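Re: the multi-chain job from yesterday

Posting the exact lines I submitted so nobody has to dig through the queue logs.
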Amino acid sequence: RGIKQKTLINYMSKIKAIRRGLPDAPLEDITTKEIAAMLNGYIDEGKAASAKLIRSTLSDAFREAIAEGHITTNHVAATRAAKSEVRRS
DNA sequence: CCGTTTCGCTCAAGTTAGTATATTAAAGCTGAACGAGAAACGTAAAATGATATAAATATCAATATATTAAATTAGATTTTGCATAAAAAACAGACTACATAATACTGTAAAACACAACATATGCAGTCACTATGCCGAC
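And the result, structure tokens for all chains:
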């Protein structure tokens, strides 16, 4: 997709967290519940900004999957995105 | 001179900062296959350079005089560019006459199938054998 080096690393850092927080079961078997169970698990730890990037990266991963004949719908576009206000003074 | 500890670096996982596009519409680029006329080449044949010497023929000045090709006219005429207009033939604008399809209407056989009482092979209904290791039992 022609990225600017660093940006690519950011994605990999978000993908490595998904495979460790979500089973390696079929995509169609992945319900919306098990996606919010892991998501909210990082929202209570104060990592609100992290949950926003993880869901945005994971959601886009399925859009490409649907395009290549794998799944019919994205069960990630149903969950809410955690808002995060800047705490930096 | 060498060892030990601090510091410059990069990998790994959180915390923020920034900018915003998809289709129409019509080209523009470039690798690869497609299709004739004119001149430089080349072997072969025809014209010419090679070559020389006494005898034959041309080289040329300076001026008188008869001769003639041919540009320079100058008047004569076919040739050439351009229509004008009517005789003669082509061809729509009419029309009845004639043979021909779409249609108007009568005349008649027969295709296509329901309906109904039988007739019966054949698939389905019900039970045992064919064919060969399981399971269970010993090794």
